[PDB]
């Protein structure tokens, strides 16, 4: 009954009004995700995605973000989902231990443009796709990520499917069906972190979410109970029989997970496991009046489960650097900031950068439970002329405890779109903000 | 380590000649797979796949089987993969516990047509794709299927990737890269059996295999050690990482797995778990001179692990019936045969068919280990007016112990293509066989 109940909750909510705060949360998620995408459109991964579109000989009217080109909705969702994750700057969501918006927002744009949808419905579909992935993440728990799966795509695909299906006009049956199709297209592994395959996870999840929904509307069948039982995808991913499943569903919309705990907005284009350490380092530098020239070493601690994604101690590519605490803290020490340019290959290969990276060491922080990059707390030690400065960082930057405010999000957008021609970034920012006023999503044209 | 050693073996074999029996085995595989596809091109799943192609606006020179249409190689692989598996009449491969040819052969035609490949290289790519999937199958063991995944696609994607890569000109590095990409596109679950999503598994695997290969040739990166260690996909699927992995590839090409145990060709369009039961029933009917009217009941036994895919005792769709021993034995009883028309919805819905299905029941056969529909043995009991006939069926139809010979494979092709315009089936049969003569694959045009 879990799958049936979830589709009832989603479709019933779809037919009802949704709160101003939820729509505002969704609006901000859109702006952050498009910023993240536009900051990454020159990456090789996205350029190759564009080449793929050329190779398909395909055509259509869904906008490929950052370029004056359109294609069919499936391939647009692929390209834009790739772009949304290309520099690891898009949001996280601790309930899922992953990045839901880099599949969901691309899917919503691709389908929304196709069907001529307006902003309230688009935003509502985001709210509901996030509620679905929150419910599934709660069901699955911590084991799925620890076992080597990337929940970003393995669970993200269901978010994308949900919003696509709703926009396409799915009823409960069609929605249940679409989730069944998606479950057989649920994939992505952690060993591909530090490669271009990581943004493919979200490209594929967006495309597959759109495709799964569209197929469902064509009377193409899949399992309508795919979340249920030992044979269902949740159990396969480690959901335990008992109350976990019942606990998960009890949340629904009271409050919406897009509000609480909400989407965590990244201050730096790198793995969240870097971010409490960076916050702490910068706070120490500011408070004590230290530059990196005044710091001889930094020790960065990690709770159980947190270090997993940071695969590279000596990263050699732009992608690897985002999964290196050495590169993150190294750049912070060298430049006094971490920016879009920090992980560009020319910056990464500076002799001075490689020197700074050698100032950084990792250590284990003891605990009886496991945590993630967006949860728990971090201990750092900053070594200086006058001794060691110890600090515990309790708030994750971007969480409700250290939220990104309007001014911060606007500056992120600006920085990610600095390459756009005169005036075009501001105009796009304004159009993005008009979704709240029920403007046609096709008018936005990121 | 395992991944690098496997790519070395594949590329070394690629550059060498392969034996005639390997070539023949590949040739027969192509013919069986195209037969199976051409028998299923009218299924709603394929019809929807063709609607998808129309929706993409895609174009190219990869032919779509059974229709006068061509598209790009990715979408042709998708459509023809869907078609190859649409009525469950394609081959099985015990070492993988799945259907490798329904992703491999579509990928080979799509890529081969694109690059103007000749028959010997096409057939060689098939042999090597099969050798890779045999290797991975041996490494993962029995647990993966039993845990709810469909090895047909989860492992089959690597077959398709290997062949596509080789045809596109991959070296070792690019092959290793392609596997990495493909590993994040490994998916498909058993709970979708009896729905249109099952043949999507093979369409998706074929397309993803072609895409992973293509992407690798564009310097799009994935993990180059993706089958190694606990973090690799084989361990994730239950293999024992470390040195023990190399036992999986100790006799690579000696003999080729495409020869021993070989591809198992189906005599009936349904799950293999139905097939020893049917062979037994027909033998008893023939030996004892019994028609279905002479038989009041049939008991069908299943060793541990074997019954798993037969999800439906009361199938209500064409797809469900293929996963129902009741439907299979029912149709055998009523008509004295099982054919392509047996599982069409009008035949399934016959009151006399529904009555015959009620004569069938299932039972467990004891063992300390688990088996599959292409291994072990089957006990059946046929009930007649005089008493009960028990029979143990030791050989799986299509295995080396009960192989499909040339005359039978040609008959299967004929039956699957009888709808074609007058003379075209034979013309196509001859063109398919021209691959053995190193003709250009582009001439074949299924």
Automatic annotation (TrEMBL), chains A, B:
Q: Which residues are in the MmgE/PrpD N-terminal domain? A: 5-242
Sequence ranges assigned to domain MmgE/PrpD C-terminal in this UniProt record: 268-418
According to the UniProt entry, where is the signal peptide? Answer: none
Coiled-coil intervals: none
Gene Ontology molecular function, alphabetical: lyase activity
Q: What is this protein called?
A: IDS-epimerase
Show the InterPro entries listed in the entry.
MmgE/PrpD_sf, MmgE/PrpD_sf_1, MmgE/PrpD_sf_2, MmgE_PrpD, MmgE_PrpD_C, MmgE_PrpD_N
Q: Which residues carry this modification: Cysteine sulfenic acid (-SOH)?
A: 271
- Give the similarity note: Belongs to the PrpD family.
């Amino acid at each position: 009954m879990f799958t049936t109940k979830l589709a009832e909750k989603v479709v019933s909510a779809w037919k009802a009004k949704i709160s101003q705060p939820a729509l505002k949360a969704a609006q901000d998620g859109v702006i952050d995700t498009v910023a993240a995408a536009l900051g990454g459109v020159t990456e090789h991964s996205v350029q190759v995605a564009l080449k793929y579109v050329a190779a398909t000989g395909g055509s259509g009217d869904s906008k490929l973000w950052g370029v004056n080109q359109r294609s069919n909705m499936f391939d647009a969702a692929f390209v834009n989902g790739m772009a949304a994750h290309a520099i690891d700057f898009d949001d996280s969501f601790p309930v899922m231990r992953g990045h839901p918006s880099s599949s969901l927002v691309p899917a919503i744009f691709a389908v929304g443009e196709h069907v001529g949808a307006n902003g309230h419905n688009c935003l509502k579909s985001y709210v509901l796709g996030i509620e679905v992935v929150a419910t599934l993440g709660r069901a699955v728990g911590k084991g799925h990520y620890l076992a080597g799966w990337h929940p970003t795509s393995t669970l993200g695909v269901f978010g994308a499917t949900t919003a696509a299906a709703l926009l396409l006009g799915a009823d409960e049956e069609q929605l249940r069906n679409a989730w069944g199709i998606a479950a057989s297209n649920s994939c992505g592994i952690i060993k591909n972190f530090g490669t271009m395959t990581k943004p493919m996870h979200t490209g594929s999840a967006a495309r597959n979410g759109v495709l799964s929904a569209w197929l469902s509307m064509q009377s193409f069948t899949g399992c309508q109970t795919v979340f249920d039982d030992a044979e269902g995808i949740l159990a396969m991913y480690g959901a335990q029989p008992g109350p976990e499943l019942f606990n998960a569903m009890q949340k629904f919309g009271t409050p919406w997970a897009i509000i609480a705990p909400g989407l965590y907005k990244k201050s730096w284009p790198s793995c969240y496991a870097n971010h409490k350490p960076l916050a702490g380092l910068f706070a120490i530098m500011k408070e004590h009046g230290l530059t990196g020239q005044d710091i001889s070493h930094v020790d960065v601690g990690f709770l159980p489960g947190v270090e997993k994604p940071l695969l590279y101690m000596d990263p050699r590519t732009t992608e690897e650097a985002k999964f290196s605490i050495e590169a993150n803290i190294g750049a912070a020490l060298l430049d006094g900031e971490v920016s879009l340019a920090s992980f560009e290959i020319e910056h990464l290969d500076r002799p001075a950068m490689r020197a700074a990276m050698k100032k950084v060491t990792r250590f284990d922080m003891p605990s009886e439970t496991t945590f993630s990059g967006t949860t728990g707390y971090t201990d750092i030690v900053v070594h200086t002329a006058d001794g060691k400065i110890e600090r515990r960082i309790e708030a994750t930057p971007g969480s409700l405890e250290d939220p990104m405010d309007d001014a911060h999000l606007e500056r992120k957008f600006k920085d990610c779109t600095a390459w756009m021609p005169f005036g075009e970034s501001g105009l796009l920012f304004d159009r993005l903000r008009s979704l709240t006023a029920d403007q046609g999503i096709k008018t936005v044209q990121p």
